[PDB]
Design a protein around this ligand. Structure first.
Ligand SMILES: Nc1ncnc2c1ncn2[C@@H]1O[C@H](COP(=O)(O)OP(=O)(O)OP(=O)(O)O)[C@@H](O)[C@H]1O
Length: 299
């Protein structure tokens, strides 16, 4: 169903959820376990007379089509790297929520890097694409990488980890969005203010992933940005509680929010959870997905 015209390159790049997200000091130092899921954007790139961006799907109305778009920035950076003008049209069919904590703009940017490399057969190796991604944004490297990975530094340095099963997810999109800088500002505010708990080390969580054990994983999920996202959007507490009472093993805010993610034991539980959330009047719209999935790849 992807747009794949002759001459074009179409690339699918996944959204993410942070299974584990510890936030340090003052970019912020991060330790995170990224997990790529089957809610993805598909990006079709063609040679054209000028650089352009068109969007359908999530944010059809509102995602900018100019220099504000991370995909614009990606095309310019890649063109410069290989010594060509960025004369491509970019079409983004988005399932990843806008400003929702699943790094959809980052997916779009990673997809453009991959699509252009193929379109022009530029021979840019994966390590060089990684460097370009890191220049673009903190979550772009993971969008290239996919699977499940331990991100350090500010998230750009990645060590793959084993997630030895298919993991079943429900995502609850919020009515609006959050600006990730606002959410980082808020966690700093919360910490000026009190001395709330920090996550344990990621050891146990990584062990549960390596065992492929969702029931063990669930109570170990955690995201230090969640308190900031819920401080800003208190209604998220209703969404989380609803998903949990519907049968999710655990609910967590995804990244800087406001999307909520719910880990379920099985496909059938994700069926139940998504159906009840949709019926509970606590979020905008509901999605079912699985992970892990691949990083940005040509279709
Ligand atoms: N390709 C794009 N898709 C969506 N938003 C984009 C894109 N390019 C630029 N933007 C702008 O970026 C912001 C939203 O980015 P995005 O949807 O990636 O947020 P996010 O998923 O919460 O990101 P993260 O979780 O990586 O911090 C908005 O300010 C939006 O106008």
């Amino acid at each position: 169903s992807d747009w794949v015209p002759t001459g074009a390159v179409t690339v699918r790049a996944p959204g993410k959820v942070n299974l584990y997200l510890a936030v340090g000091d003052l970019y912020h130092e991060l330790t995170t376990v990224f997990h790529a899921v089957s809610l993805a954007d598909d990006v079709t790139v063609r040679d054209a007379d000028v650089l352009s961006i068109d969007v359908v799907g999530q944010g059809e109305g509102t995602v900018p089509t100019d220099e504000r778009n991370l995909a614009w920035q990606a095309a310019e950076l890649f063109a410069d790297h290989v010594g060509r003008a960025p004369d491509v049209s970019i079409f983004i069919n988005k399932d990843i929520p806008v400003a929702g904590g699943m790094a959809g703009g980052s997916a779009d940017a990673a997809a453009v890097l991959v699509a252009m490399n193929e379109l022009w057969h530029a021979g840019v190796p994966r390590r060089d694409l990684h460097h370009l991604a890191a220049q673009l944004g903190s979550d772009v490297p993971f969008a290239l990488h996919g699977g499940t990975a331990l991100g350090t530094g500010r998230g750009e340095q990645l060590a793959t980890v084993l997630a030895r099963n298919v993991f079943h997810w429900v995502f609850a999109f919020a009515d609006g969005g959050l600006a990730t800088p606002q959410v980082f500002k808020e966690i700093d505010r919360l910490r000026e203010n009190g001395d709330p708990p920090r996550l344990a080390e990621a050891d146990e969580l990584l062990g549960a992933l390596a065992a492929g054990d969702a029931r063990r994983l669930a109570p170990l999920l955690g995201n230090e940005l969640q308190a900031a996202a819920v401080s800003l959007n208190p209604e998220l507490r209703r969404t989380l509680r609803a998903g949990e009472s519907a049968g999710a093993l655990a609910g967590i805010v995804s990244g800087s929010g406001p999307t909520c993610a719910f880990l379920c034991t099985s496909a059938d539980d994700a069926v139940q959870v998504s159906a009840e959330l949709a019926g509970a009047g606590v979020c905008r719209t509901v999605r079912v997905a699985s992970g892990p999935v691949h990083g940005a790849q040509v279709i």
